[PDB]
Structure 1
Amino acid sequence: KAAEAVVDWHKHDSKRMLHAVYRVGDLDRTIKYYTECFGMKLLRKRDVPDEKYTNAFLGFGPENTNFAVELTYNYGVDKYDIGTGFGHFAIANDDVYKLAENIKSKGGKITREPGPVKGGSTVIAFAQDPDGYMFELIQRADTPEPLCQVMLRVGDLERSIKFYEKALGMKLLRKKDVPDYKYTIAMLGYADEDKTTVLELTYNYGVTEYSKGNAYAQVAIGTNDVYKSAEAVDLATKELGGKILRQPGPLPGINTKIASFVDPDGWKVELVDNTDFLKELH
């Protein structure tokens, strides 16, 4: 009954990955690292005295067409627990050797030198940012979206795949078992992997739990209707696990419609009305 209506809604909606929200010890240091090392643009910066924080938004295009990072600096907080579940963000670039050497020149940290992925052929590298967040660098010819993954570790890959499909209308774009290194990955999202930001979920054999830390906050996803999309989440959570945190509705005074929830592993997602999202983008 409702599963049919959910499918129809996921088909009719136009969802978009908006941004990853996470916390940084030193906002200026991170801005400088992302602009100089990673070639990101500083898009917006907002100081919020009343609530004791400053945000900065960065990415490779404007927030109405691109995925961004939303950095949260909390006054007088200089470090966070990354935790063991948070994987990495990824940046696609047409010359990862050029990019890695740029990062090294600018005084950044390359933790994995550029070259083919172990037992694959895609050229990758890894960088670490000032707070310890890992960035994968992925060689890719020409994408509209260089900020192209958020990677989270999960305890049951099949339960997570079903959840993102049913709760969020994501397509399973890729599933790859790597038994020589005892992991399996899935890529989920709303368009071809090479054109979009995917959620990459990693399962390590026999590992069922990870710490969520207090550094990574959430990923926000846009929808034409947070109430219809939250109904789909509600149904999925009844079957698969996870929990609605904030029921769908406008924020006090602003009339910006949001809902939020956690997945079966406890990772937080915020759904934001696609039009109301635009109200802050200036």
Structure 2
Amino acid sequence: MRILHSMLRVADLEAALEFYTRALDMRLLRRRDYPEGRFTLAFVGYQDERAAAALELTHNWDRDGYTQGDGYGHLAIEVEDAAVTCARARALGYRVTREAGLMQHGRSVIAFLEDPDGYKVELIQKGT
């Protein structure tokens, strides 16, 4: 057994893809657009779906938006340097909700970004 993917609903697939590919260096693994069902799916990530868990982005062509709650937490990504990823995210005009630094009572360098839909992305610096 293995974890395949986490699925999130997005209001604007192109805006979501611009975030994951540019700010996070993910590549588009697979995309399927279904005119019959009026929805699109896009799997983004770092490794092939066969090798690792990916991020599934779902776009309902007729849904303008989604309501966020407090149940879903975040997607965490391992980065070489968290300050660098934050500065790159800011240069692209993406939201850094928590700048890189050691978290509360730990030696872990962490940072938080928000994707265009408001989903939290946790950056954890390699060495933690």
1:126 match: 112
**Aligned AA for 1:68?**
A
What TM-score comes out, normalization by structure 2 length? 0.96
Higher strand share: 2
**Aligned AA for 1:104?**
R
1:37 match: 23
Alpha-carbon offset, residue 76 of structure 1 = 2.1
Alpha-carbon offset, residue 49 of structure 1 = 1.2
Task: Give runs of ≥4 in structure 1 deviating > 6 Å.
Answer: none
Aligned length: 128
1:94 match: 80
2:99 match: 113
1:23 match: 9
**Aligned AA for 1:87?**
G
**Per-residue displacement from partner, 1:207-263 (whole Å, max 9, x unpaired)?**
xxxxxxxxxxxxxxxxxxxxxxxxxxxxxxxxxxxxxxxxxxxxxxxxxxxxxxxxx
Q: Report the structure number with the largest CA radius of gyration.
A: 1
The percent identity for this pair of structures is 42
Q: Considering only aligned residues, what root-mean-square deviation do their CA atoms show, in Å?
A: 1.1
Q: Matched residue of 1:112: which SS?
A: strand
Q: Matched residue of 2:11: which SS?
A: coil
Q: Where do 1:184-263 residues align within 5 Å?
A: none
Check conservation: 2:38, 2:62, Cα contact below 8 A: no
The question of 1:65 aligning with 2:51 is answered yes
**Aligned AA for 2:8?**
Y
Q: Matched residue of 1:25: which SS?
A: coil
Check conservation: 2:33, 2:41, Cα contact below 8 A: yes
Distance 1:128 1:22 in 2: 13
What TM-score comes out, normalization by structure 1 length? 0.44
1:46 match: 32
Distance 1:20 1:48 in 2: 20
**Relative contact order, CA 8 A, sep 6+: which one is greater?**
2
Distance 2:98 2:72 in 1: 18
Q: Which of 139, 153, 157 is the aligned partner of 2:125?
A: 139
Alpha-carbon offset, residue 77 of structure 1 = 1.0
Q: Which of 30, 45, 62 is the aligned partner of 1:76?
A: 62
**Aligned AA for 1:118?**
Q
**Aligned AA for 2:24?**
F
Check conservation: 2:82, 2:124, Cα contact below 8 A: yes
Alpha-carbon offset, residue 135 of structure 1 = 0.4
Distance 2:84 2:61 in 1: 36
Where structure 2 has 5 or more consecutive residues not aligned to the other structure, the ranges are none
1:272 match: none
